[PDB]
């Protein structure tokens with residue numbers, strides 16, 4: 740119930756893997772450091788809402804915070820992946836266990852959070868990549884794993 744869930748060497752070395760469902764991303768148009776924590780949390784909650792209302796079968800299924808949240812990218816939304824969380828990156832690998840959906844360098848991650856009780860299986864993180872710029876990426880996790888994922892993302896960030 741307290742503290743990191745995995746040995747530090749594991750997170751620093753190969754990373755920790757999870758099976759989750761990538762749910763797409765939502766462009767983020769302000770630096771997270773310019774916003775208060777409560778606002779950061781609202782942005783992630785709303786990004787989760789945006790993707791869940793579009794992607795069929797999403798467990799969590801005018802808009803607020805349109806100054807901060809922009810367009811959705813649904814190209815890879817709904818796809819099962821292996822997420823590998825390490826000190827180098829968040830690595831997102833497709834169901835063939837070959838194709839890389841995304842590899843978000845850890846140094847590019849500027850916020851991570853869960854949802855609320857209605858979206859408790861979701862993880863949101865704000866990253867940069869050359870495709871999506873600053874965007875909020877959404878993962879739908881199996882029961883139990885969302886908090887593990889969020890904790891381990893922090894562990895990786897800190898150990899980097």
Ligand code: NA
Nearest residue numbers: 751752753826
């Ligand atoms: Na390493």
